[PDB]
Design a protein around this ligand. Structure first.
Ligand SMILES: [Mg+2]
Ligand SMILES: [Mg+2]
Ligand SMILES: [Mg+2]
Lengths: 64, 78, 129, 206, 150
RNA sequence: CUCUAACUAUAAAAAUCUCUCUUCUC
């Protein structure tokens, strides 16, 4: 099964990770834009970009 | 080092009458006719792949696309 | 009341291997015992939020098929003499139950509290890692 | 159509109605679409270019790599493994032959095939090495679309090079077969295989 | 021809034990062939590889040789196996290796018979070996009884 | 001359060290 969802990132909540490569993204689900999640992105990204996810409810904590 | 490939006859290099017949017959119905692809069927060593491949262009058995050296781009003649 | 068939979640959430175990509203008949360790392998993610999420989805499916629709949730830390703090998987399990269909009512903390008795494990100086 | 009077006459197909800027005067940048909405804005099929090779100031700001021509970026990333640094003309000839092959095999206007391949070979979940000393375990994150396209193009070119090394299939043929197998779900392609491995190892180490 | 499964199905089952041979270790670990079941690949990534701290990478893997293994997840669409080696207790490893020894021993005899009669090994396992393993728990014990009882 | 609200998720291991001391006055 492929329950991927597209979420448009609206805010970059700074950067985290051991070496400092992964970024906080506040994504907003393209379906039902009422909902917002924070997640962790490898690679550069700006506001307005969209992301593809398999897991949807996983709101992972800060990597450390 | 050691020859761990232990391959077969490393491709045929001398042509045979049946080989001639099969190249003439099966030149169409294979969209791509390039020296490496002719070699891929174990039939052609490669040195004559360009040579026989050129021979296919004697009464339009295969039509060209590009003629850059170090390759060949040929398609089945419609 | 439109016949919401109530049940109880009774979340147990420690620093290790959170538990989700639905019983009847009377707290006697088990439904969907499936635990934190069931759906994770490395045994380190036992307390991880994802473990709680997976166990929660399995419980949600079994609970919906048996018949319990609304679930009353109680979160239990390790309790007793041990550390008084809700497990990290508790929040994830609660959120996951909240999403997956089953309705929610009357969440309260059930973590036991002693009268500071039965001297806690560790010694005087305690864990000196 | 209107053979224009010139004292130096451009050949016909290079002259007639060039108000129709295209890739090689052979493949159309029109009729080219991206399936996913994730990789749009990071694939530059918007501007039609005569040669996938352009001296652009495309490394000054943070995201100027986004609007480089995708076919030009494929040419540029084709040159790898020292013995082939620079030599952009050879990479352009190789991509031209690959475009020819992508045309004649499975007609499917080749720009659509290459964009479909890079779309379906961009990994979406990767791992980072959060493990400090004791629990040296990697934890899963999801991938930015720019990282997706960059990793997909790198994976495609590296698989092409690995296939073509010390093999009779010319690098053009290997790159073309890589792109063709990537456009479909064919797990025979190196890029799709490694991307699937990455996604699955992310899923295992969520 | 040497091939075919040792157990009932081709795919390994969840939460079982196998013993696998290692051939290759790329970056994330070793995806390796199985010698207890069939011949497909299954991966051990580095997190579930060494019970001790990850100090020796090649010394504990020893490319080319066999080792106990435990299957965690199965993807019953394509042939992908998730597998580990840390998670086999000291009590367990001995029964693991005993089951492998039994499965390996039963293999060679039917291999000989299949080679001699040019019958696929799959057919011999389907016909005689599998019903014996159902009757007696294992086929080698069935052959030991065959020496005693016809 | 005027008012009490926001709260997070850190511990793998790391032992030892040979000379040689040289100064302040118009
Ligand atoms: Mg200490
Ligand atoms: Mg201390
Ligand atoms: Mg000493």
């Amino acid at each position: 099964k492929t329950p991927v969802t597209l979420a448009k990132v609206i805010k970059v909540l700074g950067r985290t990770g051991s070496r400092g490569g992964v970024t906080q993204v506040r994504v907003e689900f393209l379906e039902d834009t009422t909902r917002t999640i924070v997640r962790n992105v490898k690679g550069p990204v700006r506001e307005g970009d969209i992301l593809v996810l398999m897991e949807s409810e996983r709101e992972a904590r800060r990597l450390r | 080092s050691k020859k761990s490939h232990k391959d077969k006859a490393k491709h045929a290099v001398v042509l045979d009458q049946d080989k001639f017949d099969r190249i003439m017959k099966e030149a169409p119905t294979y969209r791509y006719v390039s020296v490496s692809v002719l070699v891929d069927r174990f039939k052609l060593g490669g040195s004559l792949a360009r040579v026989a491949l050129r021979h296919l262009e004697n009464e339009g058995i295969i039509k060209p696309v590009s003629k850059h050296s170090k390759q060949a781009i040929y398609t089945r003649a419609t | 009341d439109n016949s919401q068939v109530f049940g109880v979640a009774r979340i147990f959430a420690s620093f290790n291997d959170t538990f989700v175990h639905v019983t009847d509203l009377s707290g006697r008949e088990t439904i969907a015992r499936v635990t934190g360790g069931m759906k994770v392998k490395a045994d380190r993610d036992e307390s991880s939020p994802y473990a709680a999420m997976l166990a929660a989805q399995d419980v949600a499916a079994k609970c919906k098929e048996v018949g319990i629709t609304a679930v009353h949730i109680k979160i239990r830390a390790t309790g007793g003499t041990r550390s008084k703090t809700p497990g990290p998987g508790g929040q994830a399990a609660l959120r996951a139950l909240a999403r997956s269909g089953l309705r929610i009512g009357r969440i309260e903390d059930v973590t036991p509290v002693p009268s500071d008795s039965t001297r806690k494990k560790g010694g005087r100086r305690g864990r000196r890692l | 159509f209107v053979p224009v009077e010139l004292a130096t006459t451009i050949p016909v197909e290079i002259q007639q109605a060039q108000q129709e800027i295209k890739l090689f005067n052979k493949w159309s940048f029109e009729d080219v679409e991206v399936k996913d909405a994730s990789l749009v804005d990071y694939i530059q099929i918007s501007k039609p270019i005569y040669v996938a090779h352009t001296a652009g100031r495309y490394a000054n700001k943070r995201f100027r790599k986004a609007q480089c021509p995708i076919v030009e970026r494929l040419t540029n990333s084709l040159m790898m493994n020292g013995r082939n640094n620079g030599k952009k003309l050879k990479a352009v000839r190789i991509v031209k032959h690959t475009l020819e092959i992508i045309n004649v095999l499975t007609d499917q206007n080749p720009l659509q095939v290459v964009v479909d391949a890079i779309i379906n070979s961009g990994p979406r979940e990767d791992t980072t090495r959060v493990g400090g000393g004791g629990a040296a375990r990697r934890q899963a994150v999801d991938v930015s679309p720019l990282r997706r396209v960059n990793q997909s193009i790198a994976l495609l070119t590296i698989g092409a090079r690995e296939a073509a090394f010390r093999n009779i299939k010319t690098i053009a043929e290997t790159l073309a077969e890589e792109l063709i197998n990537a456009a479909k779900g064919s797990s025979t392609s190196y890029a799709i295989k490694k991307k699937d491995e990455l996604e699955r190892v992310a899923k295992s180490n969520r | 021809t040497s091939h075919c499964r040792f157990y009932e199905n081709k795919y390994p089952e969840i939460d079982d034990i196998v013993m696998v041979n290692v051939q290759q270790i790329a970056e994330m670990g070793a995806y390796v062939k199985l010698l207890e079941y069939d011949n497909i690949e299954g991966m051990i990534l580095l997190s579930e590889l060494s019970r001790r701290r990850i100090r020796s990478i090649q010394k504990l893997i020893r490319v080319g040789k066999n080792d106990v293994a435990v299957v965690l997840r199965v993807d019953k669409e394509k042939g992908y196996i998730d597998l580990s080696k840390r998670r086999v207790s000291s009590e367990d490893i001995i029964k693991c290796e005993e089951k492998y020894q039994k499965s390996k021993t039963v293999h060679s005899i039917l291999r000989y018979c299949a080679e001699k009669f040019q019958i696929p090994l799959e057919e011999l396992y389907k016909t005689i070996a599998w019903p014996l393993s159902r009757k007696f728990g294992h086929a080698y014990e069935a052959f030991k009884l065959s020496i005693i009882d016809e």
